[PDB]
Design an enzyme around this catalytic site. Structure first.
Site, PDB file in Angstrom:
ATOM      1  N   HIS A  41      21.108  52.611 -14.813  1.00  0.00           N
ATOM      2  CA  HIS A  41      22.470  52.756 -14.302  1.00  0.00           C
ATOM      3  C   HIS A  41      22.718  54.111 -13.636  1.00  0.00           C
ATOM      4  CE1 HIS A  41      23.577  54.344 -18.508  1.00  0.00           C
ATOM      5  NE2 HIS A  41      23.850  55.337 -17.679  1.00  0.00           N
ATOM      6  N   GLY A 143      27.126  62.419 -20.443  1.00  0.00           N
ATOM      7  CA  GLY A 143      25.939  63.105 -19.969  1.00  0.00           C
ATOM      8  C   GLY A 143      24.723  62.988 -20.859  1.00  0.00           C
ATOM      9  N   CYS A 145      23.204  60.183 -21.706  1.00  0.00           N
ATOM     10  CA  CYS A 145      22.353  59.050 -21.358  1.00  0.00           C
ATOM     11  C   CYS A 145      20.936  59.509 -21.036  1.00  0.00           C
ATOM     12  CB  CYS A 145      22.956  58.279 -20.175  1.00  0.00           C
ATOM     13  SG  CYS A 145      24.557  57.575 -20.617  1.00  0.00           S
TER      14      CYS A 145
END
Lengths: 305, 305
Positions: A41, A143, A145
């Site tokens: 993503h 942030g 991820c």
């Protein structure tokens, strides 16, 4: 003596964390040999967070749309591809700090360490369990991820988790082949975590740790059978106990001289009468995020290098 | 979202751990530049664990009595000396993985990460607080002596603790200049830890973390004064609260819009009426091992490199 929520030393993983930027989105990636792994993503933009077509989004990108930085050095992306929900970015330089590693998928009830990262920089390490509903109760801000979960087995890092999303207070992600834990998707839908249950074999392992450390007040002389216990456990949202679990607890039964089914009798009483204002290993709740192996490792002392 | 007992990433410290053997005793040492630091009781033998004269014991040693190993490489000891309760071993090779570091002495109530080690090999990392009675509630087995405690401030490792002994379930050690925390000595006497108290400013910081994460059930509209609160706190073995503590909590008060003295009123009620079977951030006890800075760091997201 003593008992702590203990994480694995993180050095071997810290050297693999990089920052990955695509457009206005920046998150973390894992750099092993000449491949950077990160959540797919990172190629999404607002309009797409709802119903994205990732194959479309990827075909419209080229290698220079991906800014990868290992600290201050920049890495040149020479090729990209998608495997399920992860992106694999081929880079021109192999990470010289690549440890011995493998990719494993864990089962609910198993524990691992999380190295939380922001902008490719390690921030903190903590231990958690994969819940029976395939979420983890982590600690993550925007942030994070691409932060990874791992175990250390001898000299070898077993990567088992990559963080993708927060779902109403808990956290969901994939293995390193990009397959989600649980029935979740990497898009905005009405998905919620299902009902969680307590990991019974872990609670028993923790009660053994307590005995090893001198907390004995909950023991009793009663015993019980697997079926009588599982009858009461189902009432309190506890996972049922198998003969496999009993065998796993063998080493701890041997070291303390308390049979598993004896300990189950103590657990049955704690579930029906409560803690009565007393604590166990500094907790007023029954703790289920230590596996039998975690207890052995901490109460016997296995190292790594 | 979420809240975990989070330790600092340990990579920078893992590269400084070595094994130190003298006679039949093996423990851990810290290798920075060309000096290895370790507990001086590595030079003790049974007869001496009772009433040792360390100056005598040291004068009877020579440099080759000290076997130091960084993994498989051996380090040549070219000189030794004693500073208070640590031994400083001069070696012929400067550690090329020496981070930027300093030696700091912490105050009760402050937290740090412990890298637990055995035979020079890192085993686990966890977070703990220095208790008001100058012990830590650690997790250590035999052979863990010389394991260190540390914080990371920017790019700089602040070493604050070296482990020396277990005293009836809790743990005692020195700063890196070899001065003990607390009134303890590195010999066998009748020493015990004194009465511990609860670190009040830390409990308040944790209640702020709870609000940030959506646990609001304990709030109320009452307020109180510093002196009314400290009157009830003394009854429950809580450290009294100063105006300095209030100021430290400022940032968290600002972010949640709940005044410190408002929060103190909620704490006062929790102390007098109890938890009533409800939990806060997954705990049924009031947690006091997170500082205000720990909460900010985890609920705002500061990194290091």
């Amino acid at each position: 003596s003593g008992f702590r929520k203990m994480a694995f030393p993180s050095g071997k993983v810290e050297g693999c964390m990089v920052q990955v930027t695509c457009g206005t989105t920046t998150l973390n990636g894992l750099w092993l040999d000449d491949v950077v792994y990160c959540p797919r993503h990172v190629i999404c933009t607002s309009e797409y967070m709802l119903n994205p077509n990732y194959e479309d989004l990827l075909i419209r990108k080229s290698n220079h749309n991906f800014l990868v930085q290992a600290g201050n050095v920049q890495l040149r992306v020479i090729g990209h591809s998608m495997q399920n929900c992860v992106l694999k970015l081929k880079v021109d330089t192999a990470n010289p700090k690549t440890p011995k590693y493998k990719f494993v998928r864990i089962q609910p009830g198993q524990t691992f360490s999380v190295l939380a990262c922001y902008n490719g920089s390690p921030s903190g390490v903590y231990q958690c369990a994969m819940r029976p509903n395939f979420t983890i109760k982590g600690s993550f801000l925007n942030g994070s991820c691409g932060s990874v979960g791992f175990n250390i087995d001898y000299d070898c890092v077993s990567f088992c988790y990559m963080h993708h999303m927060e779902l109403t207070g808990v956290h969901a992600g994939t293995d390193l082949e990009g397959n989600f834990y649980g029935p979740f998707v990497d898009r905005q839908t009405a998905q919620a975590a299902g009902t969680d249950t307590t990991i019974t074999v872990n609670v028993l392992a923790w009660l053994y740790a307590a005995v090893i450390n001198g907390d004995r007040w909950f023991l009793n002389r009663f015993t019980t059978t697997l079926n009588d216990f599982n009858l009461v456990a189902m009432k309190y949202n506890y996972e049922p106990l198998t003969q496999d679990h009993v065998d796993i607890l063998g080493p701890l039964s041997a070291q303390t001289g308390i049979a598993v089914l004896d300990m189950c009798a103590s657990l049955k009483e704690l579930l029906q009468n409560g803690m009565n204002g007393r604590t166990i290993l500094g907790s007023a709740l029954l703790e289920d995020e230590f596996t039998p192996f975690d207890v052995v490792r901490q109460c016997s002392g296995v190292t790594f290098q």
